[PDB]
Symmetry: C2
Subunit: 54 residues, 2 copies
């Protein structure tokens, strides 16, 4: 109950916190790499706006 129960119950919990927050970061970065890429060549205000999001 000290070691193995605690580990199963609440010993993976901050690894799983960090991992879901971390893949959330890459979800948003995957989306903003797309966003960064949808910039027309003529544009400059869209370029700095897209690039700030990236």
């Amino acid at each position: 109950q000290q070691q193995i129960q605690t580990l199963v119950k609440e010993g993976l919990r901050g690894f799983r916190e960090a991992r879901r927050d971390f893949w959330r970061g890459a979800e948003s970065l995957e989306a903003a790499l797309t966003h960064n890429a949808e910039v027309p060549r003529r544009r400059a205000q869209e370029a700095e706006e897209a690039g700030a999001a990236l």
Copy 2:
């Protein structure tokens, strides 16, 4: 015929060359100051294009 005829005939001729070329420069600069001023605030490719003409 040496001095006063020559001066009347062809003695003002390079002053008048320089002056009409010079007011021509300011005609085009008056027009390009207008041109420089017709730039929408959103724009950056129009800004550098207008500004190069100025």
